[PDB]
Amino acid sequence: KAHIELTINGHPVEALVEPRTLLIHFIREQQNLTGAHIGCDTSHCGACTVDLDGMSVKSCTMFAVQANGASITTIEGMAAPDGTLSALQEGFRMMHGLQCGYCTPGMIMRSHRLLQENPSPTEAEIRFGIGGNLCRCTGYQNIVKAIQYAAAKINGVP
Amino acid sequence: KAHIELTINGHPVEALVEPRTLLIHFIREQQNLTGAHIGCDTSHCGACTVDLDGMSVKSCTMFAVQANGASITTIEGMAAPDGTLSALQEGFRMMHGLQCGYCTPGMIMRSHRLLQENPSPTEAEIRFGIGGNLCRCTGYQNIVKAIQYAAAKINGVPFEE
Amino acid sequence: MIPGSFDYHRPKSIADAVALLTKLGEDARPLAGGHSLIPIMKTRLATPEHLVDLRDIGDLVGIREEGTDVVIGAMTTQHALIGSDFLAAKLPIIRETSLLIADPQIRYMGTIGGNAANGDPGNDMPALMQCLGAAYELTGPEGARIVAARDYYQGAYFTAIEPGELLTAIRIPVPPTGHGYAYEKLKRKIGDYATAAAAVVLTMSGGKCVTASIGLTNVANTPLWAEEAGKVLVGTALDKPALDKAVALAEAITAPASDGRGPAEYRTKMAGVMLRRAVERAKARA
Amino acid sequence: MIPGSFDYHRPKSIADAVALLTKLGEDARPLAGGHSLIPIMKTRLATPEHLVDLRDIGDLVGIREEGTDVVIGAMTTQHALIGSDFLAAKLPIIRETSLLIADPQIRYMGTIGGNAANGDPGNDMPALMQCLGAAYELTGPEGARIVAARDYYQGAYFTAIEPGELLTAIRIPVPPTGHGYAYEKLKRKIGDYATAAAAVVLTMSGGKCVTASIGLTNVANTPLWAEEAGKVLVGTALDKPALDKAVALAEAITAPASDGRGPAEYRTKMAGVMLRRAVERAKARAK
Amino acid sequence: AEKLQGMGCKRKRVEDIRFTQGKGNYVDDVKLPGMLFGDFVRSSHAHARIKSIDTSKAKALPGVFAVLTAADLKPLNLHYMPTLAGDVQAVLADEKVLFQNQEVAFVVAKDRYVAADAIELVEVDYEPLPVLVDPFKAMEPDAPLLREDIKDKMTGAHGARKHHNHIFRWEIGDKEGTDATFAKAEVVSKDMFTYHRVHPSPLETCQCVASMDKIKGELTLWGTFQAPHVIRTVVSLISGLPEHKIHVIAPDIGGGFGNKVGAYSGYVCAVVASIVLGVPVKWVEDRMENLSTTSFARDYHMTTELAATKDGKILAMRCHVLADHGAFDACADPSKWPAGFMNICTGSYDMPVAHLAVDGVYTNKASGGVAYRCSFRVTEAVYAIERAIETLAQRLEMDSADLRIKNFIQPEQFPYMAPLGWEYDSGNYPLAMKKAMDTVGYHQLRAEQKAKQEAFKRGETREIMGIGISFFTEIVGAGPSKNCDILGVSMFDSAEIRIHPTGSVIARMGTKSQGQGHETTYAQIIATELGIPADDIMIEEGNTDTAPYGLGTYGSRSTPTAGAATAVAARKIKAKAQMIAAHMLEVHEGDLEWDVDRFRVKGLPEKFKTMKELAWASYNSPPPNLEPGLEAVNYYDPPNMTYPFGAYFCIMDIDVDTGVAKTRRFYALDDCGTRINPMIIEGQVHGGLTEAFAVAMGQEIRYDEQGNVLGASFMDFFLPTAVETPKWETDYTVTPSPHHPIGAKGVGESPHVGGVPCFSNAVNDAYAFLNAGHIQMPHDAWRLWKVGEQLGLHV
Amino acid sequence: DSAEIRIHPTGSVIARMGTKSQGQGHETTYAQIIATELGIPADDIMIEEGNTDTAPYGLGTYGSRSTPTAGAATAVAARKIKAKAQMIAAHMLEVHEGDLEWDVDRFRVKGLPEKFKTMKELAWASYNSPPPNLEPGLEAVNYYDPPNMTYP
């Protein structure tokens, strides 16, 4: 087993892992951060998306040993330390951007990076920008609203 | 922390413990064997009794480090692998020797050793022989019956009524 | 979903990675972005005993202009290609292509060298690189060598690389300023490998095509360079008759798979349609 | 319930234990059965920095006949005392006394040397050892010495032991064959220290008491050897008038505590009743 | 006022708080002490005898605790399990395999990594048998004998048992009358419409955690169950454990879409393994196994005919279906309905007579049928009729909107007995059709289309325009005890509501959400009924120990059944509160009137008692006539189904040269009666229209001649992303259900039921001027290219 | 105090009360009361107390009150179930309720003892074929306001 050290949601983590352990299983099983989900076995759905060193990554398509030294944010990390929801979390609720909730962690983690890439996206930019994330429940329309709502809130803060 | 290796309920155990950790807390908190209970802070009640190298021990009055190399049985270790309860476990149910159940693990673990010390005890020998174990619910009378039942079961013949 | 066990290595340098690959042999595979290899390990179609992760090798990442070429390190990500305004000024077809590959997550990880080396005819970069007449720089235990992209692909997962070599960079001649370009892809949805796609670069003068080069994606067991189809455009006004000729010559070399994207006959025709549409958009650009 | 932290040591020999206790000073305590020490650590009445566990010293456990004595190693448990056929033959008062100490679990762990060394006037062994005229063998950094049990106890938790020393064994002169003996304890329940208790060993010939010795438990800040009370029995028939004299001489050296067991006056009187009863039972047993 | 958030409010969802923070509790999130992981060795063959299974290398592997085969199950009589259709399905294959990826052995290991290693070590020896995948051939005299466990060879149709591959024949309607009409009608319009096999593909796959507590003799089973009480009862009947010792828990479920109604082999094997080992056993399937081994949807081949006058009056409908059920009939349905409610296929139209026949057949494929927002085969019924309307209209040279308008059941005809036996509750079809046509500018679209067609013929454009129409009548809320039961349990549902002394509420229902918002919306019903703010009400479902017995969530039945029970239970509480108020105010109950959140004395509106006050009084000063406290239960047996309806219009543009279709506009009018939460309904519609788009335009599961399952992964199975999914335009009318306690109809499946015919009708309409005929779904690019290729459009 | 009793389709029972045992055997004895009232073996009944989300509201265990209060409620709630069961039996046997007599665990037709329905059969029937005037299922609650103390 390999010894890894990394940061998840601002906290140091150290672990001994088999190289073949997928990062999504390390997060869910060893770290007990069960927000991130698995929706497929071919890398299409994006339910396992995390933010890793400034990137949106499908954590089912990376080994935990590749994340050695990384800084990872998962959905558990998105709320403020006082409990206050992020703009994206709030937007998804206000705009009815989720139903069963299963894609939601990955959608919000992807969208967190999208609004850093492009803080003021058009609808076409939003749809393309979340092209790696599948949802079965919403038909995407309210997800676009949620992202737009969040961008407006963020753009108001400063 | 101190490194310890022992046997509990027939299984090898390896652990790290602070020297001051009481055995009762190692068993409950670290091993998650929560059958043993704490009923006092002065070593009177016996609710923490375990069987340790052939002795009945109040695990609240021993450090886990003292049990390095030992063999312990707790109440979880009493039933057979085939599901079937020990003679004592069965006798406590048959004779209504428990109510709240809080003393019962310690009573059964004491009684397990008692019946090895003395396989056919008199009533007075039973009462004396569990003197280190308090019960609040039963008034002891049915506990004595339970231990008599178990003895008669083990021995294949009854003794006193 | 679950891969077989392997040992994991992080060499510090090209030399160390080539030494490892050479020593461990067939049972070791380079690991770049992992977004083709890890999926086939998870199905256990691949069961390598060792992975040699190229992540710590800084010399494998980067975009520079060297003489009349742009040289791109093999570990440069799709996201980085898209982000390079320097690449967009010189080789704008790369951005256009890269935006048609996979999805944002995959593009953060997937590399240009992995896309080139992988050997899946579904990959988009191979035929683009054939269209651009790129060269692949390979380094192994016997030293450096160069293989044209046009000569690199023999079949599905069969390529010109040898045991112990890494593809370390891609060297791309820079087209003239004002060249036309297009990458036109037909697919079932975001992320899908092409039903058919065409890469075109061309130059014009006085209403006539002076140079043209065409690549075809995922319409054979390899990428294809449509040599004859590009030649027939040269000297023409890129009008109907000329396009019909190029389409014929391009269709003629296809040999597509019949799969969920449709039967081979459809995909042959789609290579033609993509080619027409790409030439038109290139023409307008030029 | 929770003790303060400490470092834990398991010396392999008496010599090593003594070297440790000497090196570490008052911050280190020997750990025997732990059934007085651990309870007071748990209340933080005792906060030693080091516990020197004697368990790996095989030399400290045992019952040996040597010369005209029995020599009992300090780590010998109460349970082992009770189970000894040899003690039951030569010193039957020990079994009788042990079975009046604590409870089965505590007796599996608690040791004779810890009972003797502890210094609590509630312990039963001290006055029994005074009755029997036992000697305590101590080993320390300056070597071996012997202190009569009759001289070992100066006050509550105040004994003749010196820094670095361990009580290693108790040497008990074997009483004559046919001696009488008794330990008579008054207590509130199983496990309770005595309201009062009396240890008696005596011998008889031809209707008359030849020897007598009396110890009194938990009726002063130490055990007591009731020297004059025993002396006044010698020569008598151990009848009510003789006993009246012994009782007066015994009561007169008591100085009990007033606690939940009752007022001091009650406990003094109970010492006298326990004495009468112990003498009567020892008389019957004699021959 | 601001706090009530009752009926009609766009109340924001209470579930979202936990789900947006990763604090949902889905099955794979569960971790129990000692819990192992199990998964299957699966068949590489579609049809073969099993000669031998060698498990010895797998058992030997460190970290492997058990490898079950059918030999371990038999003695428990658990090598087959019952289905909802009244067949049985193999749990682990015994003598033979019958579909590719069928379960053959169950490996139980320390974790899912070791399990996967050990599966690859098991060696199965097969002997190939001839594969049957074409249902049109299933009842030929030389068709393979699949189901050797239940059937003997029977090669024709006139023996004392049906053909060995024939599952059932079901017929309904007036055969003689229908035949007589078709014999004399001026126009007879016939087509064979295939509704191709697809799959519900919930983003979370099927999974469970079984925990047999051997010390207590009690089983806890966490799982992905749309009907957790039904699963308890089934587990009881098959295991022999009594219901009070089986604790089923359906926690948060990551979508169901019908995939999670029935039992699967993984549930049974986890349970058996846990019983054997005495520790918990988790089973979680991967996507490729979900798609290829759990409930498929559709696979009906519908020979559909309408008889009409030349002026467009529909005289009769005659429909015969060949249903491909795969290897075992596991099709979820009420027990008396083997083709579900396919007998709603006369749709929105007033026809005198009709006749329907359905034949089910076995093939070498996964089981299922009823899934993916089908409402029990109403998807298929609506497709049949709405496609038949269009092909009839073509044959009549009539505009199909006008043909519908000529034939609609009129509002005054409700309740309407339709000619295949359902009595429709309420509907205003002409008003909804008009609203829709006006909104989309229908007649102007047709003129635009005609001009575009002329341009196409002049060589001026390569794009063609289609106008899809789907006017549909749904049937949801199964259902009355007379004819609706699941394995002998009548299809009621239930609610229990308990008001605490300080006026907050705990309520539970016998349904189970998989994202439809129940935890938000059931509280809105109670809030309006009792005047108690919705946030003061906790809703729970899915724990069989605690929730009242119900039949689960499927058939858009939650609002018809448990929503009704909720209202009726609330009204029991209200009635008891009225008696308490009468006692407190010293009046007769008949002197009181309810006013939002209080009872007032008629004429002395000053005198009143609030619901909050009455709740406290029920505990503090209970009237001596009455029991203390304030709670109620209702188990609601519906008098009829509810029949929501819709009018959907799609404008589609198609590039004939590539086959690529692009939706221009999609307008969806739904009328589900009283609307509890317009925000939630809108979301349900968005989701269902996206499914409809997927099914009509790309999704499929296929089988080749060797029985290999094709396209059963996200490499091929078309799930749209945000890029492909159209924008949706939604609208409504409100036509309450007369019999429902709050007038509310189900709606969740409507968008898919109506949406698929809308899309397919649009594609078919685009090509109608070129005489393409019926184009079979899906309408992906290669297939629409082939349409044009065959019409000569490319040369 | 209070009791809620729910009979499952296959005839076992979950019942909860508003008291809370600390060793007095409620989990055993409340089932005994139900068993006699309903003719369902005690072993087929699960008793729970102490989870305020699930148990009906009660005032707890003290004052030796459990038998007087919840024990009364248990009997009363079980009699509500028996009364519903008698209605179901009458419907199934096609007689009047007053023609039925109870025999330990079943209703028999008076003078025709071969015509009977057991409680188990009635429980299934309540789910499978609810008589058209009744609700499905078979369960009841009682909150018992005692008329006096008991004076042992």
Ligand SMILES: Cc1cc2nc3c(=O)[nH]c(=O)nc-3n(C[C@H](O)[C@H](O)[C@H](O)COP(=O)(O)OP(=O)(O)OC[C@H]3O[C@@H](n4cnc5c(N)ncnc54)[C@H](O)[C@@H]3O)c2cc1C
């Ligand atoms: C859902 C999904 C959709 C996708 N869609 C597309 C798409 O539309 N078009 C497209 O082009 N791609 C697509 N891809 C594939 C993607 O672009 C991969 O990133 C690419 O194929 C491989 O690059 P990589 O860096 O991830 O290589 P890896 O996966 O790390 O390696 C791939 C192979 O190349 C070898 N290799 C890698 N680097 C070197 C090197 N420097 N020298 C020699 N050998 C090397 C590896 O050993 C392995 O055999 C998709 C992938 C996913 C998961």
Ligand SMILES: Cc1cc2nc3c(=O)[nH]c(=O)nc-3n(C[C@H](O)[C@H](O)[C@H](O)COP(=O)(O)OP(=O)(O)OC[C@H]3O[C@@H](n4cnc5c(N)ncnc54)[C@H](O)[C@@H]3O)c2cc1C
């Ligand atoms: C509930 C209960 C009831 C009890 N009832 C009685 C009773 O009725 N009568 C009675 O006599 N006792 C009673 N006891 C006390 C018991 O007998 C103890 O075992 C005894 O007092 C101390 O012996 P130990 O071996 O447990 O010593 P420890 O607890 O290990 O040590 C006690 C003290 O002696 C010192 N020490 C121990 N061994 C040596 C040595 N060899 N040399 C130098 N110092 C040493 C220790 O450092 C410590 O200061 C009871 C105890 C409990 C918990």
Ligand SMILES: Nc1ccn([C@@H]2O[C@H](COP(=O)(O)OP(=O)(O)OC[C@H]3Oc4nc5nc(N)nc(O)c5nc4C(S)=C3S)[C@@H](O)[C@H]2O)c(=O)n1
């Ligand atoms: N008149 C109405 C009708 C419904 N609603 C609200 O809409 C929701 C859906 O109610 P209903 O139509 O009764 O449907 P069910 O809750 O019974 O859902 C079942 C249905 O739900 C569908 N939509 C789904 N949506 C999600 N997110 N997940 C699934 O698994 C779903 N599966 C499908 C399939 S398949 C089916 S059968 C409820 O919150 C309800 O209060 C309303 O506000 N007013």
Ligand code: FES
């Ligand atoms: S689980 Fe589907 S992309 Fe990772």
Ligand code: FES
């Ligand atoms: S909210 Fe259910 S998959 Fe997106």
Ligand code: FES
């Ligand atoms: S807890 Fe009371 S003797 Fe141990």
Ligand code: FES
């Ligand atoms: S059974 Fe309650 S303390 Fe003994």
